[PDB]
C-alpha cells in the first residue's frame, strides 16, 4: 500500500543547533488519533537490534522514559522486515514514536514499498505510536549528532491541512 503520507512540514528537529530545522517525513496513517496533535520527544538510536526486527527484550533494551523526562523517539534503520512490525516491536519496548531511516538516499515515496508496507490489520490497527519514514540524510545527521554526545530533541506535528508554526 502507501500508508505513509509524505509531508514537508510535520517534523522539526529542535536541538542541537547544528541539525535544527524542519524536515520532510512520511507519517503512517495509523498510530495517531484522528484529530490534530503534536508529540515532543528525544531521539535514541539503539546499540543493537537497530532494524527492530527482533524483540528488544532479547537485548535487554528498553525505551521507557523516566517520569518528567522527554518521551523516547526511536531511530530505526530500514530493512529485513516490514514497517508495522518495526513499529510494533518498538512499541512493545516502550517507544513513544518511531522514525525509520531509509538505507538509500532517495525520495521518501520510493521507500514506501509493497513489500515493506503491508496490509495486516492486526498490526495496523494496534499501533499506538506515531510512525514516520525519514530520509537517509536526516537519519545520518541524527546519528552524527548523537555520536558527538548531544541530545537530539524533536517534534512531530501531524495535524493535516493546516500550517504548523
Swiss-Prot record:
Tissue distribution: Mostly expressed in roots and dividing cells (at protein level). Also expressed in seeds, seedlings, leaves, stems, flowers, siliques and pollen.
Glycosylated residues, chain numbering: 126
Localization annotation: Membrane; Golgi apparatus membrane; Cytoplasmic vesicle, Clathrin-coated vesicle membrane; Prevacuolar compartment membrane
Induction trigger: Slightly induced by water deficit.
Highest taxon above the source species: Eukaryota
Span of domain PA: 34-146
Coiled coil: none
Protein family per UniProt: Belongs to the VSR (BP-80) family.
Domain notes per entry: The tyrosine-based internalization signal may be involved in trafficking at the trans Golgi network (TGN).
Oligomeric form and interacting partners: Interacts with the N-terminal propeptide of ALEU and the C-terminal part of the 12S globulin CRA1 in a calcium-dependent manner. Binds to EPSIN1.
Its biological purpose: Vacuolar-sorting receptor (VSR) involved in clathrin-coated vesicles sorting from Golgi apparatus to vacuoles. Required for the sorting of 12S globulin, 2S albumin and maybe other seed storage proteins to protein storage vacuoles (PSVs) in seeds. May also be implicated in targeting N-terminal propeptide containing proteins to lytic vacuoles.
Protein name: Vacuolar-sorting receptor 1
Native organism: Arabidopsis thaliana (Mouse-ear cress)
Span of the entire protein shown here: 20 to 182 of 623
